[PDB]
Amino acid sequence: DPKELVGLGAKSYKEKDFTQAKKYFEKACDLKENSGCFNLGVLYYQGQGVEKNLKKAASFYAKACDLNYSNGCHLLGNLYYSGQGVSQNTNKALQYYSKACDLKYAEGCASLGGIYHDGKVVTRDFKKAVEYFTKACDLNDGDGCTILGSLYDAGRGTPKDLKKALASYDKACDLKDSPGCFNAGNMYHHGEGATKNFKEALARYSKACELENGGGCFNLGAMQYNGEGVTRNEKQAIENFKKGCKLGAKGACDILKQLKIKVHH
């Protein structure tokens, strides 16, 4: 029944019948349905079906977190971190992010890795940053894998290991993180973390370029312009160069200015 109540509330929510949605979520949360409490918190946060009040939203996220709804722990972590809805409190933020992470919520692990990595609200700790980003990456957080990749490459908080760096970037690439495909391509093109393989670098750069990564299209164009990866091609390599420049790849813009050699009429 409680599960069904949340479903009815979600349906009313989609129809923008926030009043009824609130009634269903209230009933579900009273019956200890964690997603019901969470959704109720969202309504107070957005002022939908009720006057906006982020402090009340926080109390409902707290109820959801007590009922082990990882997403509830994470948003509460964000509220304490920024002092939104409740007073700023780093200690509590770390506490809630940590539970979200223990409950397998990738973003929670990522937030913690980012905090210990930047060392703004806490003393920088690359060691912990690696541990949390390792958890985030194992939980499929694309950006987390990429950051973890950079830690392995730099050897911060962990032994410098180009092979692990590449694996992280590669996974990040599978997770659709273009920066990951970019770095992965670079390593494959420079023979770092693995034997030089223009073929692999080509696939990486292509995926990165497809994901709208400027440097991805640019480096991909250079591959073709020098016939490194594939056979050889300039009329199509200049195509990727334009896209790179469009996406922001400066090297692509300039290089394009020197490839303006064509028969005129």
Curated annotation (Swiss-Prot):
Disulfide bonds join C29-C37, C65-C73, C101-C109, C137-C145, C173-C181, C209-C217, C245-C253. It is found in: Secreted. GO terms for biological process: response to antibiotic. Coiled coil: none annotated. The keyword Hydrolase applies. GO terms for cellular component: extracellular region. It is an enzyme of class 3 (hydrolase). It catalyses: a beta-lactam + H2O = a substituted beta-amino acid. It comes from the Bacteria. Keywords: Antibiotic resistance, Disulfide bond, Hydrolase, Repeat, Secreted, Signal, TPR repeat. TPR repeats lie at residues 2-35, 37-71, 73-106, 107-143, 145-178, 179-215, 217-251. SMART domains: SEL1, TPR. PROSITE patterns: TPR. GO terms for molecular function: beta-lactamase activity. Its EC number is 3.5.2.6. Belongs to the hcp beta-lactamase family. Antibodies against HcpC are present in sera from human patients infected by Helicobacter pylori. May hydrolyze 6-aminopenicillinic acid and 7-aminocephalosporanic acid (ACA) derivatives. This is Putative beta-lactamase HcpC. The gene is hcpC.
